[PDB]
C-alpha cells in the first residue's frame, strides 16, 4: 500500500505542508505575527512557514490519531512551561490557533466533522495516500521484493 506509514513522517508532513502552501485556502490569518504557538513557549515561532506546517501537522495528527477535539489538540500541543522556581506544569496549547487551523482544514475538505472532534475526510486520506506513493516513489528501489514476489 501507499500508506503514509511506509514513509518517514518528516518528508510526508513537509509534502503536505507544501501542498497546503500551494492552496490559497490556507493562509496565516492576521494575528500570526504577534501570537506564539500557544501558552507554553516563550516566544512566537521563528520559522517562516509555521502556520502551513502547523496545519499539515494537525492533519497528520488527525489522520494517525483519529477524530480529535480542539482541547485534545491543545493538550497534544503543550510544552514545558517555564515558571521560574515552580514545578514546571504542562498546561495546554491555544484554542484560537487550533480552531482556526482546524477550520482551514475543513474548508479545504480534508477534515470531516464528527461528534468527538473532526476525523480526517476520505478525500484527504486518498490524496495523502497518493502523496505517500509519490514519496515512496523516491524510495521504490529499496525493496524490490514487494510487488508480487
Contact 87, 94 (CB under 8 A): no
Give the Cα-Cα-Cα angle 129, 95, 44 (nearest 5 degrees). 85
Least gap, CB of 51 to RNA (angstroms): 9
18 binds RNA (CB under 7 A): no
Three cell numbers at 86?
Answer: 515552580
Q: For RNA, which residue of 23, 25, 90, 138 counts as binding (CB under 7 A)?
A: 90
Q: For RNA, which residue of 89, 107, 138, 139 counts as binding (CB under 7 A)?
A: 89
- Cα 50 → chain centroid: 11
88: partner contacted, choices another protein, RNA, none (Cβ within 5-8 A by kind): RNA
| Residue placing its CB nearer to RNA in the complex, 23 or 113 | 113
Of 21, 103, 24, nearest in space to 58 by CA: 103
3 binds RNA (CB under 7 A): yes
Least gap, CB of 9 to another protein (angstroms): 7
Interface contacts to another protein, rule CB under 8 A: 3, 5-9, 31, 33-34, 42-44, 46, 139, 142-143, 145-146, 148-149
Least gap, CB of 82 to RNA (angstroms): 7
Q: For RNA, which residue of 18, 27, 69, 134 counts as binding (CB under 7 A)?
A: 69
User: From the CB of residue 67, how many other CB atoms can be counted at a distance below 10 Å?
Assistant: 16
User: From the CB of residue 46, how many other CB atoms can be counted at a distance below 10 Å?
Assistant: 6
Query: Taking the CA atoms of the chain, what radius of gyration do you get in angstroms?
Result: 17
Amino acid at each position: 500500500m501507499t500508506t503514509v506509514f511506509d514513509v518517514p513522517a518528516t518528508e510526508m508532513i513537509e509534502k503536505l505542508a507544501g501542498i497546503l502552501k500551494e492552496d490559497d485556502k490556507i493562509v496565516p490569518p492576521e494575528w500570526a505575527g504577534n501570537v506564539k504557538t500557544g501558552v507554553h513557549k516563550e516566544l512566537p515561532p521563528t520559522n517562516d512557514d509555521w502556520w502551513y506546517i502547523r496545519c499539515a501537522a494537525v492533519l497528520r495528527k488527525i489522520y494517525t490519531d483519529g477524530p480529535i477535539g480542539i482541547e485534545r489538540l491543545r493538550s497534544v500541543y503543550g510544552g514545558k512551561k517555564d515558571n521560574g522556581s515552580k514545578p514546571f506544569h504542562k498546561a495546554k496549547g491555544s484554542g484560537s490557533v487550533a480552531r482556526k487551523t482546524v477550520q482551514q482544514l475543513e474548508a479545504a475538505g480534508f477534515l470531516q466533522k464528527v461528534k468527538d472532534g473532526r476525523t480526517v475526510s476520505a478525500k484527504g486520506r486518498s490524496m495523502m495516500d497518493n502523496a505517500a506513493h509519490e514519496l515512496k516513489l523516491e524510495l521504490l528501489e529499496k525493496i524490490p521484493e514487494l510487488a508480487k514476489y
